[model samples]
Target: HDAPLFEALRAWRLQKAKELSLPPYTIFHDATLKTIAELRPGSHATLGTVSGVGGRKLAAYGDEVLQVVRDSSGG
Candidate 1:
């Protein structure tokens, strides 16, 4: 149901969550991450359109998420 890009995103999510002292799921649900991987959003506006990505999440994690998507897409 997911690609290598999605897996990379999940791994990053895990590390980021740990850095913030929060659970991975608290950062973003698996479903949301999957959607992100599938959609491969290229910008903040596009990412905001994905499910579960609200104002706070867009501000907090949008940049890195987009970067991961770009990196994974390139590889």
Candidate 2:
């Protein structure tokens, strides 16, 4: 079976990055977001620990990203 959650999350970011005219890493490095997905980070604070993620990205987009996580895990 496919990894629906991770795939969805990744596709979302990829498109978001494109819309912003930036590489996906500018929004989120694949490694960082994948790590968050793998760990199923439960909060903005925890999600911030992913490599390449930090205050700016978290403050701006953490909630939305975390929502994706919540959706993936069926929360």
Candidate 3:
């Protein structure tokens, strides 16, 4: 699929995990991030549709995640 986007998303996840002192999957499982990269959601509602992204994550990290997606592509 979109390996570039996947890599960017993983790097973003890694940074977040390090800052929050949480395990990588604790922020978002690799499956979840992979789906995100493949799907390339453009909005909060669409991002929320991904399985691993629940209300708390959508509220807390939705905007930033979408920012990464948009900047990575869709420019």
Candidate 4:
């Protein structure tokens, strides 16, 4: 639904991976991110509902994910 959001997420994931010295896929797989972009979840609860977003990842990434989605969608 939101390619810009997807692009923003992709870009953010790259930098985030670098920041953590982790592989990009370790942050999130493309399908999960694609789903994230599609869903544009507004809260950790909704974001957690995405298949790939387990508790740890949701804790780590939930805020920034919502931020990015908010930013990409016009804040």
Best by lDDT: 3
Candidate 4 residues lying further than 4 Å off, grouped into runs, are 50-60
Q: What is the C-alpha local distance difference test score of candidate 1?
A: 0.66
lDDT of 1 by residue, 1-75 (tens): 445656767877786776669888787665765666666546646656455445565577767767776786666
Model 3: lDDT equals 0.68
- State model 2's lDDT: 0.62
Q: What is the C-alpha lDDT of each candidate?
A: 0.66, 0.62, 0.68, 0.67
What is candidate 4's CA lDDT for residue 5? 61
Measured against the true structure, the TM-scores of the candidates, in listed sequence, are 0.56, 0.53, 0.60, 0.59
- Colliding pairs, model 1: none
Residue pairs clashing, model 2: none
User: What's the ranking of the predictions by lDDT, best on top?
Assistant: 3, 4, 1, 2
What's the residue-level lDDT of 15 in candidate 2? 59
True lDDT of residue 18, candidate 4: 74
After the best TM-score superposition of candidate 3, give how far the Cα of residue 58 lies from its true spot, in angstroms: 3.7
By TM-score, the better pick of 1 and 2 is: 1
> Could you tell me the TM-score of candidate 4?
0.59
